[PDB]
Coordinates of C-alpha atoms and ligand atoms in Angstrom, one line a residue:
Chain Z
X1 CA 24.7 -21.6 49.1
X2 CA 24.8 -21.2 52.9
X3 CA 22.9 -24.5 53.2
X4 CA 25.9 -26.5 52.0
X5 CA 28.2 -25.1 54.6
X6 CA 26.1 -26.1 57.6
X7 CA 27.2 -28.7 60.0
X8 CA 24.7 -31.5 61.1
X9 CA 23.9 -29.7 64.3
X10 CA 23.3 -26.4 62.5
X11 CA 21.0 -28.1 60.0
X12 CA 19.0 -29.7 62.8
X13 CA 18.8 -26.4 64.7
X14 CA 17.5 -24.6 61.6
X15 CA 14.9 -27.2 60.9
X16 CA 13.7 -27.4 64.5
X17 CA 13.4 -23.6 64.6
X18 CA 11.3 -23.6 61.4
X19 CA 8.8 -26.1 62.7
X20 CA 5.2 -24.9 62.3
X21 CA 2.9 -24.7 65.4
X22 CA 0.4 -27.4 66.0
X23 CA -3.0 -26.0 64.9
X24 CA -6.5 -26.7 66.4
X25 CA -9.7 -27.8 64.7
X26 CA -12.3 -25.0 64.5
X27 CA -19.7 -37.1 56.0
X28 CA -19.3 -33.5 54.8
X29 CA -18.9 -32.1 58.4
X30 CA -15.8 -34.4 58.8
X31 CA -14.3 -33.2 55.6
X32 CA -15.4 -29.7 56.6
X33 CA -13.1 -29.7 59.6
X34 CA -10.3 -31.6 58.0
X35 CA -10.4 -29.2 55.0
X36 CA -10.4 -26.1 57.2
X37 CA -7.5 -27.5 59.2
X38 CA -5.4 -28.4 56.2
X39 CA -6.1 -25.0 54.7
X40 CA -4.7 -23.3 57.7
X41 CA -1.8 -25.7 57.9
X42 CA -0.9 -24.9 54.3
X43 CA -0.1 -21.3 55.0
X44 CA 2.4 -22.3 57.7
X45 CA 3.8 -25.0 55.4
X46 CA 4.7 -22.4 52.8
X47 CA 6.5 -20.3 55.4
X48 CA 8.2 -23.4 56.8
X49 CA 9.4 -24.4 53.3
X50 CA 11.1 -21.0 52.8
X51 CA 13.1 -21.8 56.0
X52 CA 14.4 -25.2 54.9
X53 CA 18.1 -24.6 54.1
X54 CA 18.6 -24.5 50.3
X55 CA 15.0 -24.1 49.4
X56 CA 14.9 -20.4 48.7
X57 CA 18.0 -20.7 46.5
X58 CA 15.7 -22.2 44.0
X59 CA 13.6 -20.3 41.5
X60 CA 10.1 -19.5 42.4
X61 CA 8.8 -21.9 39.8
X62 CA 10.8 -24.8 41.1
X63 CA 9.8 -24.0 44.7
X64 CA 6.2 -24.3 43.7
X65 CA 6.7 -27.5 41.7
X66 CA 8.3 -29.1 44.8
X67 CA 5.4 -27.9 47.1
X68 CA 2.8 -29.0 44.5
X69 CA 4.2 -32.5 44.6
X70 CA 4.9 -32.8 48.4
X71 CA 2.1 -31.0 50.2
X72 CA -0.1 -33.9 51.0
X73 CA 2.9 -36.1 52.0
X74 CA 4.1 -33.3 54.3
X75 CA 0.7 -33.0 56.0
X76 CA 0.5 -36.8 56.4
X77 CA 4.0 -37.1 57.9
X78 CA 3.1 -34.4 60.4
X79 CA -0.1 -36.2 61.3
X80 CA 1.7 -39.5 61.8
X81 CA 4.3 -37.8 64.0
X82 CA 1.6 -36.1 66.1
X83 CA -0.1 -39.5 66.5
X84 CA 2.8 -41.7 67.7
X85 CA 1.8 -41.7 71.4
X86 CA -1.8 -42.4 70.6
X87 CA -1.8 -46.0 69.4
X88 CA -4.7 -46.9 67.3
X89 CA -5.4 -43.2 66.9
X90 CA -4.9 -40.3 64.7
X91 CA -4.4 -36.8 66.3
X92 CA -5.4 -34.5 63.5
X93 CA -5.4 -31.7 66.2
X94 CA -5.2 -31.7 70.0
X95 CA -9.0 -31.4 69.9
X96 CA -9.6 -33.8 67.1
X97 CA -8.4 -37.3 68.0
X98 CA -9.9 -39.9 65.8
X99 CA -10.1 -43.7 65.9
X100 CA -10.6 -46.3 63.1
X101 CA -14.4 -46.2 63.3
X102 CA -14.5 -42.5 62.6
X103 CA -12.5 -43.0 59.5
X104 CA -15.4 -44.8 57.9
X105 CA -17.5 -41.8 58.0
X106 CA -16.3 -41.1 54.4
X107 CA -16.3 -43.6 51.6
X108 CA -12.8 -44.5 50.8
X109 CA -11.3 -42.9 53.8
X110 CA -10.6 -45.8 56.1
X111 CA -8.1 -47.3 53.7
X112 CA -6.0 -44.3 54.2
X113 CA -6.4 -44.1 58.0
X114 CA -5.3 -47.7 58.3
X115 CA -2.1 -46.9 56.3
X116 CA -1.6 -43.8 58.4
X117 CA -1.9 -45.8 61.6
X118 CA 0.6 -48.4 60.3
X119 CA 3.0 -45.5 59.7
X120 CA 2.7 -44.2 63.2
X121 CA 3.2 -47.7 64.7
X122 CA 6.3 -48.1 62.5
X123 CA 7.6 -44.7 63.8
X124 CA 6.8 -45.9 67.4
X125 CA 8.5 -49.3 66.7
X126 CA 11.7 -47.5 65.6
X127 CA 11.7 -44.8 68.4
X128 CA 11.8 -42.0 65.7
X129 CA 13.3 -38.9 67.3
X130 CA 12.1 -35.3 66.6
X131 CA 15.4 -34.4 65.1
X132 CA 15.0 -37.3 62.6
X133 CA 11.4 -36.3 61.8
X134 CA 12.3 -32.8 60.7
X135 CA 15.0 -34.2 58.5
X136 CA 12.6 -36.6 56.9
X137 CA 10.0 -33.9 56.3
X138 CA 12.5 -31.7 54.5
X139 CA 13.6 -34.7 52.5
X140 CA 10.0 -35.1 51.3
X141 CA 9.9 -31.4 50.2
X142 CA 13.1 -31.6 48.2
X143 CA 12.8 -35.2 46.8
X144 CA 9.2 -35.7 45.9
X145 CA 9.2 -33.4 42.9
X146 CA 12.8 -33.5 41.8
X147 CA 12.3 -36.2 39.2
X148 CA 9.5 -34.4 37.4
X149 CA 11.0 -31.1 36.5
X150 CA 9.9 -30.7 32.8
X151 CA 12.7 -28.3 31.7
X152 CA 16.1 -29.1 30.3
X153 CA 17.7 -25.6 30.5
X154 CA 21.1 -25.1 32.1
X155 CA 19.2 -23.5 35.0
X156 CA 17.0 -26.6 35.5
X157 CA 20.1 -28.9 35.5
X158 CA 21.7 -26.6 38.2
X159 CA 18.5 -26.5 40.2
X160 CA 18.3 -30.4 40.2
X161 CA 22.0 -30.6 41.2
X162 CA 21.5 -28.2 44.0
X163 CA 18.6 -30.2 45.4
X164 CA 20.6 -33.3 45.4
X165 CA 23.5 -31.7 47.2
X166 CA 21.1 -30.4 49.8
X167 CA 19.6 -33.9 50.1
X168 CA 23.2 -35.2 50.6
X169 CA 23.6 -32.7 53.4
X170 CA 20.5 -34.0 55.1
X171 CA 21.7 -37.6 54.7
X172 CA 24.9 -36.6 56.4
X173 CA 22.9 -34.9 59.2
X174 CA 20.8 -38.0 59.8
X175 CA 23.9 -40.1 60.0
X176 CA 25.6 -37.7 62.4
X177 CA 22.6 -37.7 64.7
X178 CA 22.6 -41.5 64.8
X179 CA 26.4 -41.5 65.4
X180 CA 26.0 -39.1 68.3
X181 CA 23.3 -41.3 69.8
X182 CA 25.8 -44.2 69.9
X183 CA 24.7 -46.3 67.0
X184 CA 27.4 -48.5 65.3
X185 CA 28.2 -47.8 61.7
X186 CA 26.2 -50.9 60.6
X187 CA 23.3 -49.6 62.7
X188 CA 23.7 -46.1 61.2
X189 CA 23.3 -47.3 57.6
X190 CA 20.5 -49.7 58.6
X191 CA 18.4 -47.1 60.3
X192 CA 18.9 -44.5 57.5
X193 CA 17.6 -47.1 55.0
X194 CA 14.7 -48.0 57.3
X195 CA 13.7 -44.3 57.5
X196 CA 14.0 -43.6 53.8
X197 CA 12.0 -46.7 52.8
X198 CA 9.1 -45.4 54.9
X199 CA 9.0 -42.4 52.6
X200 CA 8.0 -44.8 49.8
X201 CA 4.9 -45.8 51.8
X202 CA 4.1 -42.1 52.5
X203 CA 4.3 -41.4 48.7
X204 CA 1.9 -44.3 48.3
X205 CA -0.6 -43.0 50.9
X206 CA -0.5 -39.5 49.3
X207 CA -1.1 -41.0 45.8
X208 CA -4.1 -43.1 47.0
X209 CA -5.5 -40.1 48.9
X210 CA -5.5 -38.2 45.6
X211 CA -6.9 -41.1 43.6
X212 CA -9.9 -41.5 46.0
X213 CA -10.5 -37.7 46.1
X214 CA -10.7 -37.6 42.3
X215 CA -14.9 -30.9 46.3
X216 CA -12.4 -28.6 44.6
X217 CA -9.5 -28.6 47.0
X218 CA -6.1 -29.5 45.6
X219 CA -3.9 -26.3 45.7
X220 CA -3.0 -25.3 42.2
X221 CA 0.3 -24.2 40.8
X222 CA -1.0 -20.6 40.6
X223 CA -2.3 -20.6 44.2
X224 CA 1.0 -21.9 45.5
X225 CA 2.9 -19.3 43.4
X226 CA 0.8 -16.5 44.9
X227 CA 1.2 -17.8 48.5
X228 CA 4.9 -18.1 48.0
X229 CA 5.3 -14.6 46.6
Chain O
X1 CA 18.8 -69.3 56.7
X2 CA 18.7 -66.0 54.8
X3 CA 20.0 -64.0 57.7
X4 CA 23.1 -66.2 57.9
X5 CA 24.2 -65.2 54.4
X6 CA 27.2 -62.8 53.9
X7 CA 27.1 -59.9 51.5
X8 CA 28.8 -61.9 48.7
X9 CA 26.5 -64.8 49.3
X10 CA 23.5 -62.4 49.1
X11 CA 24.8 -60.8 45.9
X12 CA 25.5 -64.2 44.3
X13 CA 22.0 -65.4 45.3
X14 CA 20.4 -62.4 43.7
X15 CA 22.5 -62.4 40.6
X16 CA 21.8 -66.1 40.1
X17 CA 18.0 -65.5 40.5
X18 CA 17.7 -62.9 37.8
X19 CA 14.9 -63.7 35.4
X20 CA 15.4 -63.8 31.6
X21 CA 14.9 -61.0 29.1
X22 CA 11.8 -61.9 27.1
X23 CA 10.8 -60.8 23.6
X24 CA 7.7 -59.0 22.5
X25 CA 5.4 -60.9 20.2
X26 CA 7.1 -61.1 16.9
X27 CA 6.1 -59.1 13.8
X28 CA 3.1 -57.2 15.2
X29 CA 1.2 -54.9 12.9
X30 CA 3.1 -51.7 12.8
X31 CA 2.2 -48.7 13.2
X32 CA 0.4 -49.5 16.4
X33 CA -3.2 -48.6 17.4
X34 CA -4.0 -47.9 21.1
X35 CA -5.5 -51.4 21.4
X36 CA -2.6 -53.2 19.8
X37 CA 0.1 -51.5 21.7
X38 CA -1.7 -52.2 24.9
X39 CA -2.2 -55.8 23.8
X40 CA 1.5 -56.3 23.1
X41 CA 2.5 -54.7 26.5
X42 CA -0.1 -56.8 28.4
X43 CA 1.1 -60.0 26.7
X44 CA 4.7 -59.2 27.6
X45 CA 3.9 -58.4 31.2
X46 CA 1.8 -61.5 31.6
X47 CA 4.7 -63.7 30.5
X48 CA 7.2 -61.7 32.6
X49 CA 5.0 -62.3 35.7
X50 CA 5.5 -66.0 35.6
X51 CA 9.3 -65.5 35.8
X52 CA 8.9 -62.8 38.5
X53 CA 7.3 -65.4 40.7
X54 CA 10.2 -67.8 40.2
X55 CA 12.7 -64.9 40.9
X56 CA 10.8 -63.9 44.1
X57 CA 10.9 -67.4 45.5
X58 CA 14.7 -67.2 45.2
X59 CA 15.1 -63.9 47.0
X60 CA 16.6 -64.9 50.3
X61 CA 14.0 -64.9 53.0
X62 CA 10.9 -64.6 50.7
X63 CA 9.8 -68.2 51.0
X64 CA 10.1 -68.1 54.8
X65 CA 6.9 -66.1 54.7
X66 CA 3.4 -67.6 54.6
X67 CA 1.9 -68.0 51.2
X68 CA -0.6 -65.2 52.0
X69 CA 2.1 -62.7 52.9
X70 CA 4.1 -63.7 49.8
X71 CA 1.1 -63.0 47.5
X72 CA 0.5 -59.7 49.4
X73 CA 4.1 -58.5 48.7
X74 CA 3.8 -59.4 45.1
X75 CA 0.4 -57.8 44.6
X76 CA 1.8 -54.6 46.0
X77 CA 5.1 -54.7 44.1
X78 CA 4.6 -56.3 40.7
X79 CA 4.3 -53.2 38.6
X80 CA 7.2 -51.4 40.4
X81 CA 9.3 -54.5 39.7
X82 CA 8.4 -54.6 36.0
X83 CA 9.1 -50.9 35.8
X84 CA 12.5 -51.0 37.5
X85 CA 13.4 -53.8 35.1
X86 CA 12.4 -51.7 32.2
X87 CA 14.4 -48.7 33.5
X88 CA 17.4 -50.9 33.9
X89 CA 17.1 -52.4 30.4
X90 CA 16.7 -48.9 28.9
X91 CA 19.8 -47.3 30.5
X92 CA 22.0 -47.7 27.4
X93 CA 19.2 -46.3 25.1
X94 CA 18.9 -42.6 25.9
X95 CA 15.5 -41.2 25.1
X96 CA 13.9 -44.6 24.6
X97 CA 12.4 -47.5 26.6
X98 CA 13.6 -51.0 25.9
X99 CA 10.5 -53.0 26.7
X100 CA 12.0 -55.9 24.9
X101 CA 15.0 -56.4 22.5
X102 CA 12.5 -56.2 19.6
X103 CA 10.3 -53.5 21.2
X104 CA 12.1 -50.2 21.7
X105 CA 9.8 -47.2 21.9
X106 CA 10.5 -43.5 21.7
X107 CA 8.5 -40.6 23.2
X108 CA 6.1 -40.2 20.3
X109 CA 5.1 -43.8 20.7
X110 CA 4.3 -43.2 24.3
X111 CA 1.7 -40.7 23.0
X112 CA -0.4 -43.7 22.0
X113 CA -2.7 -45.0 24.6
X114 CA -3.8 -41.7 26.0
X115 CA -1.9 -40.3 29.1
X116 CA 0.7 -43.1 28.8
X117 CA 3.2 -40.5 27.7
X118 CA 3.4 -39.0 31.3
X119 CA 4.7 -42.3 32.6
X120 CA 7.0 -42.6 29.6
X121 CA 8.6 -39.3 30.6
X122 CA 8.8 -40.4 34.2
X123 CA 10.4 -43.7 33.2
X124 CA 13.0 -42.0 31.0
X125 CA 13.9 -39.6 33.8
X126 CA 14.5 -42.6 36.1
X127 CA 16.7 -44.3 33.5
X128 CA 18.7 -41.1 33.0
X129 CA 19.2 -40.8 36.8
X130 CA 20.5 -44.4 37.0
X131 CA 22.9 -43.6 34.0
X132 CA 24.0 -40.5 35.8
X133 CA 24.6 -42.4 39.0
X134 CA 26.2 -45.2 37.0
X135 CA 24.1 -47.8 38.8
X136 CA 25.8 -51.2 38.9
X137 CA 24.1 -54.5 38.2
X138 CA 24.8 -55.8 41.7
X139 CA 23.1 -52.6 43.0
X140 CA 20.1 -53.1 40.7
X141 CA 19.4 -56.6 41.9
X142 CA 19.6 -55.4 45.5
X143 CA 17.2 -52.5 44.8
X144 CA 14.7 -54.8 43.0
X145 CA 14.7 -57.1 46.0
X146 CA 14.0 -54.2 48.4
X147 CA 10.9 -53.2 46.3
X148 CA 9.6 -56.8 46.7
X149 CA 10.1 -56.9 50.4
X150 CA 9.3 -53.2 51.2
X151 CA 6.3 -52.2 49.1
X152 CA 3.8 -54.4 50.9
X153 CA 5.2 -54.7 54.4
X154 CA 3.5 -51.6 55.9
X155 CA 0.0 -52.9 54.8
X156 CA -0.2 -56.3 56.5
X157 CA -2.8 -58.0 65.0
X158 CA -1.1 -61.3 65.7
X159 CA 2.2 -62.7 67.1
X160 CA 2.8 -64.3 63.7
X161 CA 2.1 -61.1 61.7
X162 CA 4.6 -59.4 64.0
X163 CA 7.2 -62.2 63.5
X164 CA 6.6 -61.9 59.7
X165 CA 7.3 -58.2 59.6
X166 CA 10.3 -58.4 61.9
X167 CA 11.7 -61.1 59.5
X168 CA 11.1 -58.9 56.5
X169 CA 12.8 -56.0 58.2
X170 CA 15.8 -58.1 59.2
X171 CA 16.2 -59.3 55.6
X172 CA 15.9 -55.7 54.4
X173 CA 18.7 -54.9 56.8
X174 CA 20.8 -57.6 55.4
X175 CA 20.2 -56.2 51.9
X176 CA 21.2 -52.7 53.1
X177 CA 24.4 -54.2 54.5
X178 CA 25.0 -55.8 51.1
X179 CA 24.6 -52.5 49.2
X180 CA 27.0 -50.8 51.6
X181 CA 29.5 -53.6 51.3
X182 CA 29.3 -53.3 47.5
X183 CA 29.9 -49.6 47.7
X184 CA 32.7 -50.1 50.2
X185 CA 34.5 -52.6 48.1
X186 CA 34.3 -50.2 45.1
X187 CA 36.3 -47.6 47.0
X188 CA 33.7 -45.1 48.2
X189 CA 34.4 -43.3 51.5
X190 CA 31.9 -43.7 54.3
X191 CA 30.3 -40.4 53.5
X192 CA 29.9 -41.4 49.9
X193 CA 28.6 -44.8 50.8
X194 CA 25.7 -43.4 53.0
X195 CA 25.0 -40.6 50.5
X196 CA 24.7 -43.1 47.6
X197 CA 22.5 -45.4 49.6
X198 CA 20.2 -42.5 50.3
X199 CA 20.1 -41.5 46.6
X200 CA 19.2 -45.0 45.5
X201 CA 16.5 -45.5 48.2
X202 CA 14.9 -42.1 47.4
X203 CA 14.5 -43.1 43.7
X204 CA 12.4 -45.9 44.9
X205 CA 9.8 -43.4 46.1
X206 CA 9.7 -42.2 42.5
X207 CA 9.2 -45.7 41.2
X208 CA 6.3 -46.1 43.7
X209 CA 4.8 -42.9 42.3
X210 CA 5.1 -44.1 38.7
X211 CA 3.5 -47.4 39.6
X212 CA 0.6 -45.6 41.3
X213 CA 0.0 -43.3 38.4
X214 CA 0.0 -46.3 36.0
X215 CA -2.8 -48.0 37.9
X216 CA -4.8 -44.7 38.3
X217 CA -4.8 -44.0 34.6
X218 CA -5.7 -47.7 34.1
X219 CA -8.8 -56.7 34.7
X220 CA -5.3 -56.7 33.3
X221 CA -4.0 -56.6 36.9
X222 CA -2.9 -60.1 38.3
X223 CA -5.4 -61.3 40.8
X224 CA -4.7 -62.7 44.3
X225 CA -5.8 -66.1 43.1
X226 CA -3.6 -66.0 40.0
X227 CA -0.6 -65.0 42.0
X228 CA -1.3 -67.6 44.7
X229 CA -1.7 -70.4 42.1
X230 CA 1.6 -69.5 40.4
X231 CA 3.4 -69.5 43.8
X232 CA 2.2 -72.9 44.8
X233 CA 3.3 -74.5 41.5
Ligands
LIG301 C1 -7.5 -32.2 48.6 O1 -6.7 -33.4 48.5 C2 -7.0 -34.4 49.3 C3 -6.7 -35.7 49.0 C4 -7.0 -36.8 49.8 C5 -7.8 -36.6 51.0 N1 -8.1 -37.7 51.7 C6 -9.5 -38.2 51.7 C7 -9.7 -39.3 50.6 C8 -11.2 -39.7 50.4 C9 -12.1 -38.5 50.1 C10 -12.0 -37.6 51.4 C11 -10.6 -37.1 51.6 S1 -6.9 -38.4 52.7 O2 -7.5 -39.4 53.6 O3 -5.8 -38.9 51.8 C12 -6.3 -37.0 53.8 C13 -5.4 -37.5 54.9 C14 -6.3 -36.9 56.1 O4 -7.5 -37.2 55.6 C15 -7.6 -36.4 54.4 C16 -7.2 -35.1 55.0 C17 -7.6 -33.8 54.3 C18 -8.9 -33.5 54.1 C19 -9.3 -32.4 53.4 C20 -8.3 -31.6 52.8 O5 -8.6 -30.5 52.2 C21 -6.9 -31.9 53.0 C22 -6.6 -33.0 53.7 C23 -6.2 -35.4 55.9 C24 -5.3 -34.5 56.7 C25 -5.7 -33.2 57.0 C26 -4.8 -32.4 57.8 C27 -3.6 -32.9 58.1 O6 -2.7 -32.2 58.9 C28 -3.2 -34.3 57.8 C29 -4.1 -35.0 57.1 C30 -8.2 -35.3 51.3 C31 -7.8 -34.2 50.5
LIG302 C1 5.7 -46.1 25.7 O1 6.0 -45.8 27.0 C2 5.2 -46.1 28.0 C3 4.3 -47.2 27.9 C4 3.4 -47.6 28.9 C5 3.4 -46.9 30.1 N1 2.5 -47.2 31.1 C6 1.0 -47.0 31.3 C7 -0.1 -48.0 30.9 C8 -1.5 -47.4 30.6 C9 -2.0 -46.1 31.4 C10 -0.8 -45.1 31.5 C11 0.5 -45.6 30.8 S1 3.1 -47.9 32.6 O2 4.5 -47.4 32.7 O3 2.2 -47.8 33.7 C12 3.3 -49.7 32.3 C13 1.8 -50.2 32.1 C14 1.9 -50.5 30.6 O4 2.9 -49.7 30.2 C15 4.0 -50.2 31.0 C16 3.8 -51.6 30.9 C17 5.0 -52.5 31.1 C18 6.1 -52.0 31.8 C19 7.3 -52.8 31.9 C20 7.2 -54.1 31.4 O5 8.3 -54.9 31.5 C21 6.1 -54.6 30.7 C22 5.0 -53.8 30.6 C23 2.5 -51.9 30.6 C24 1.6 -53.0 31.1 C25 0.5 -53.3 30.4 C26 -0.4 -54.3 30.8 C27 0.0 -55.0 31.9 O6 -0.7 -56.1 32.3 C28 1.2 -54.7 32.6 C29 2.0 -53.7 32.2 C30 4.2 -45.8 30.3 C31 5.1 -45.4 29.3

């Protein structure tokens, strides 16, 4: 796999080049816009995923399982990244900048906004860099579904092992970026841990988003398979 | 004085704080019903929770927090903590979950209690991963402490609130240093050290997922008052 031969700088360059554009917005009127926005973002996400080194080496079925598991987390991490320089607010799009009080417009929707704002403030706290962000987003794509592959074929074992090797490459990339920026080794491993522990909170926000939502709108396995073909 | 500890002092503190293995209620009616399996698991969890509170109060830095913040961390983390304990106990029992020395369940017993079998499968996958990584006890206790301090930290506008979180993050940093020191003394290169750190911390995202799905399918949940009372005593 070409992915495993990449240096840290080449991994970063690939991921930065794959970044989707920032899209614009075009009770049920709030969901209306958010749903229309997310629907358009999903098409770009599929095409971004195909450009994450290592992803297309997987079978189509495994590519869809990973996207099925990660898509809301990926949308949320993008939102939190967009929102860092707007404290107390969430920039869903350049023309859709929302404060806490506009969260309440939907029943259980403020709990999630508060958690999203706390994630943006954490990123701001830590001075998260764009090169670190793209690494974290690709970690979400590969990691979130890797522990729920249902098969036990030789192929499934080889797919899981490939995913973990690619994840190790991204870990190496994160450490290299920190080393280049002048962090000591102790600081390097401390910051890596801080960044990966935030992914647990992003999993949590995604899960709660789903729980509240369970308005047919969660992309199915078959939809993702069609979009990825 | 948690931030003054060294790695060995941190490891020893955590090792020394481990709670005991508890048994399931003896000689239940077998085969189980849905209600009786849930009853056994609830009774075991309720007894484990008391010992979890004692353990938490011995995690370096935990008791420096206010009582409110201590309860908040426990409310967020308790199921994850129980589950990582289960996964650890089950490592040497492939295909089965050792809920207690006298309660070892296979997959078909997960299929009791409707939808429970999904979390069963997820829990066995985690135990298999730990076995494949050959997770060491000293690493397990570090990971369980991270769950306690991490799971609730992001869901606390005051100076004190800000001091509280900074303290939690500095302790989390010391525990990260401890994990690296343990991997370093075991002979892993720098690259292997950071890669293994990452692999372990990413599994915690899966434990979070399993904990969330448990509640969703699911009161039996420990209340804020219950947790607070236990902490003050
Ligand atoms: C379809 O499964 C979903 C799961 C959760 C949510 N949610 C809410 C929970 C309570 C009930 C209303 C929705 S939620 O709050 O967890 C979710 C986060 C934010 O609000 C939401 C929303 C969204 C809305 C509609 C949609 O079809 C896709 C995403 C968002 C969004 C959209 C674009 C983006 O780039 C980043 C975030 C929305 C959709
Ligand atoms: C047989 O294979 C399994 C058994 C139980 C589960 N689970 C779910 C519970 C119902 C809805 C969906 C399933 S689960 O993994 O979410 C977890 C909850 C339930 O099972 C586990 C469990 C437990 C885990 C570790 C312990 O050391 C002690 C107890 C139980 C428990 C019951 C009542 C409580 O007050 C607290 C916990 C998963 C797999």
